[PDB]
Each structure stands twice: as C-alpha cells, then as structure tokens.
Design a protein around this ligand. Structure first.
Ligand SMILES: NC(=O)c1ccccc1Nc1ccc(Cl)cc1
Ligand code: NI
Length: 341
C-alpha cells in the first residue's frame, strides 16, 4: 500500500513509489534521484512511464535495464507539460541527477516536492522566487538542532590537505575512498586532482560514473588500478581487515594506506570540530570518517522553510514514529511563530 506522503493530490502522479505494485489511478511515476530506497521496485520489467532527470534516466537504462520507451527525461529549470499538468524540475543539491519537483495543479494549488536535498541560499533565486507554494513535501532527515556539520567546501579542504601531506611525506602511501551509491564524488575527485592521479575503480563503478555527465570524466577515472594512487572500494571494505587484504593485492607497490569513509552526521559532530578530526590507526593503516553531508543541516532546512513560507508541510523522512512526528511538528510551529507568519 502506497503511503499518502508519496501521492500528489488532484493528479495522476506519485513520487518515488515503485515498491507497491500497480498504484491505483497513477498515470505517471516520478523518480527524484537514483538512490535505492527511492527506486526500490524498479527493474528491467517495469511497463509504466517514468519521469526524471537526464542523469537519472541514464542510470535507469544502463544500471537497472529499464526499456528506453518507458524513460521520460526532462530538462531542468524548464516549464514542461506532463499528462496535462505543468511541472518544473529543479536541482536538489543532493547526488548527481537529483531533483526537486514543482507541480502547478489545475485548481491553482502549487506543490513543491524536495525529494532528498541539501538546502542552499542559491535556491532562493531559482524559479521558486516567483510564486507562492501551498504544500511542501520536505526532506526532514536531520530535522533536529543537534544535527550540525560543516560546509562541503570545509570538508573537502580537510581531505585534500590530509591526503597531500601524507603522500608527500611517504610517496609509497596509497589513498582509498569508500563508496556504496552515487553521491559525494567530490571527495575522491578532489583528492586525486591534488595528487596528480586518475581515480582507479572496478568495472561496475566505472560504468556508474560514466552515466553522470561529469565534464572531462575520461581524463579523471580509470579501471587500471596499477596506474592510479587513489582507489575506490566498497564502503563495507573500509576497515582494518579489508584494507590489509587490499594492500596485499597491490604487489609491493605500496607500504601504507590512508582511507576515507564519507558518512553523514555522526555523534562526534557534537564534540569535535572538522580541523580537530583524527583517524583510527592500526600499524600502517589509518581511517578517517569525514562528515560530508548531501542532506540539509537543521539550520539550512529552517532557513529554507522560513524563506518559502508554505501553507502546509508534509514530512517525507522520520515519519515512522510518533516521537519523531511530534518533534518535527513542534519545530515547524517554532519556525512559523519566529517568522511572524
Ligand atoms: N505541518 C505544518 O504545516 C505546520 C504545523 C504546525 C505549525 C506550522 C506548520 N507549518 C509551517 C511552519 C513554518 C512556516 Cl514558515 C510555514 C508553515
Ligand atoms: Ni538520497
């Protein structure tokens, strides 16, 4: 059974609703981004129209093998008509190809669905600037004031400086970066650039990256592990056992590993500043957890909502518990009161 918060009222549309079989009355299925919790249920045998970004469409065709006849890519920042309803896709500042969707209902109601997003002041000068939004379907992943983390720029600066220092001190050190989905590509691209290397990876991960429309990508990545001093591995392998095993396979080219695990928020954010972050170390292996978020912090979310001033908010994350739901509702009321709205 499809939950109410994935249905767009007054339309034949659903958002990120592929795991419920045939949804009654749904004439078009929207997909905000290529993360598995959102595409769950899509496969090569799907036979209904899917609306999405160009990048998401590349991944559907090449990774999930969805037939081309059912994939409907739309350009960003452009008014489009879908089954008689005006829609716009906006960049979500999440992972590559991730969008927010604006729906202009026949009755005059306007709905924004954020998908997954990291709110930014630049969104205040998108096509959102024009008009009023009645309903906001909101990515509430980190809707609580304890959720603080640095800018993506500060986190990248830390990674680049850490990697460049380590490898300049020891030219026989290998850098390893963990991954389990698209998103957070800047971490490994920025480290490789400072080291004057391509990023080496599996054939499957190389395929995925070739779908993302990243400029000059052929100059940045490779399947030839031997040529590269920055390697990607599955996130599950970023531990002392997994990294020891990998070092053995490199045939005496390297004698040290510096590894990075990009996480979201962790509790160590409530104690430590980014500049003060230290690794876990065992012998010749060191592992840094870095707080590289592709979701809004509490403060970024609050600013966005107080700027937009929607009439109604519908959370799409943390909706499973009464405690979570009551906590979010109390923050929404605070924000409204403080705004003078
Ligand atoms: N869920 C809601 O819609 C809501 C509930 C309780 C109190 C306020 C609310 N919505 C809101 C908050 C802040 C702003 Cl700026 C605009 C709308
Ligand atoms: Ni996501």
């Amino acid at each position: 059974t499809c939950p109410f918060y994935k249905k767009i009222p007054g339309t034949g549309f659903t958002v990120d609703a592929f795991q419920y079989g045939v949804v009654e009355g749904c004439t078009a299925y929207f997909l905000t981004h290529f993360h598995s919790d959102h595409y769950a249920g899509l496969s090569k045998h799907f036979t209904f129209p899917v609306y999405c970004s160009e990048i998401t469409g590349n991944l559907l065709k090449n990774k999930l093998h969805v037939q081309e006849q059912y994939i409907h890519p739309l350009p960003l920042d452009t008014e489009c008509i879908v089954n008689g309803v005006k829609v716009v896709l906006l960049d979500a500042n999440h992972c590559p190809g991730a969008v927010m969707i604006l729906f202009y209902l026949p009755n005059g109601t306007v709905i924004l669905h954020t998908g997954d997003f990291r709110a930014d002041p630049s969104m205040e000068r998108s096509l959102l600037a024009d008009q009023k939004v009645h309903m906001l379907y909101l990515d509430t992943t980190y809707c609580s004031p304890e959720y603080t983390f640095p800018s993506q720029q500060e986190v990248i600066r830390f990674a680049i400086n850490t990697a460049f220092e380590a490898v300049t001190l020891n030219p026989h050190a290998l850098v390893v970066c963990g991954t389990y989905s698209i998103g957070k590509e800047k971490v490994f691209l920025a480290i490789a650039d400072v080291l004057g290397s391509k990023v080496g990876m599996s054939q499957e991960k190389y395929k995925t990256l070739q779908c993302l429309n990243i400029p000059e990508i052929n100059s940045l990545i490779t399947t030839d592990m031997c040529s590269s001093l920055v390697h990607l591995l599955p996130m599950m392998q970023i531990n002392f056992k997994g990294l020891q095993s990998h070092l053995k396979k490199c045939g005496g080219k390297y004698n040290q590993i510096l590894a990075f695990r990009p996480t979201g928020w962790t509790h160590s954010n409530k104690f430590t500043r980014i500049a003060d972050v230290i690794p876990q170390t065992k012998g010749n292996i060191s592992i840094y957890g870095i707080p590289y978020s592709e979701h809004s912090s509490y403060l970024e979310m609050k600013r966005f909502v107080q700027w937009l001033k929607p009439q109604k908010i519908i959370p799409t994350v943390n909706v499973g518990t009464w405690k979570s739901r009551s906590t979010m509702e109390k923050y929404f009321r605070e924000w409204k009161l403080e705004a003078g709205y």
